[PDB]
Amino acid sequence: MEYQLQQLASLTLVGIKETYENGRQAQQHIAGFWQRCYQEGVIADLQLKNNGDLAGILGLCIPELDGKMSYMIAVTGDNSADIAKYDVITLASSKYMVFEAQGAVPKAVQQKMEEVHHYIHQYQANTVKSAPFFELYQDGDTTSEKYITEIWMPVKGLEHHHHHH
Ligand SMILES: CC[n+]1c(-c2ccccc2)c2cc(N)ccc2c2ccc(N)cc21
């Protein structure tokens, strides 16, 4: 499968985080969460705030300690803002395997994701389960079947994988 290696320094993310029972339940409600965020003007507001560290809006899947799964819609933002209403988190530095989904959101993303999970099955010692993974949505028309969504999966010690020697 095609992917690019990218690295990120520590980042501050601003947005809204919701929590669901598990991965399956999250998929049922994520589309709704996005719909609610757009309708209430949250997306527009968050878009004003990105300092440009990452281009776009992020949809992060965050594992919770009790087995629950959280989803956060956010942008990379500056710490120096009052920022009372929004949820804020620090995304720890990491290296990632970055994949692309070409197509209309979100079906193109879901199908690409099933594929990604299957592919990373072979990199069990390198993937980081407790670490957040995310979809990055750049400016553009989601509807177009030429639209590209980036999927960022965090990894550790990937250089040591035998397939790379
Ligand atoms: C809920 C559909 N929807 C929309 C969307 C589509 C049409 C109008 C408004 C939002 C969306 C729009 C942007 N920019 C970025 C991500 C998503 C998204 C992501 C996941 C999902 N599961 C549904 C999603």
How would you explain this protein's 3D organization?
The chain has helices spanning 23-39, 42-49, 107-119, and strands at residues 4-8, 11-20, 57-63, 69-76, 87-91, 94-102, 133-137, 148-155. With 165 residues, it is α+β, with helices and mostly antiparallel strands. The two termini are 17 Å apart. Ethidium binds at residues 30-31, 34-35, 38, 59, 105-106, 137, 142.
Secondary-structure blueprint:
Blueprint: E1 4-8, E2 11-20, H1 23-39, H2 42-49, E3 57-63, E4 69-76, E5 87-91, E6 94-102, H3 107-119, E7 133-137, E8 148-155
Antiparallel strand pairs: 1-6, 2-4, 2-5, 3-4, 3-7, 6-8, 7-8
The structure holds ethidium.
PDB class: unknown function
Keywords: GyrI-like domatin, multi-drug recognition, unknown function
Assembly: monomeric
Task: Please describe the structure with a list of short key phrases separated by commas or semicolons.
alpha+beta, 8-stranded antiparallel sheet, 35% strand, globular, unknown function, GyrI-like domatin, multi-drug recognition, monomeric
What's this entry about, in short?
It is built from three helices and eight strands; from the N terminus they run E-E-H-H-E-E-E-E-H-E-E.
Q: What is the alpha-carbon Rg in Å?
A: 16 Å
CATH superfamily: Regulatory factor, effector binding domain
Report the CATH topology name.
Answer: Multidrug-efflux Transporter 1 Regulator Bmrr, Chain A
State the share of residues found in helices, binned by percent.
10-25%
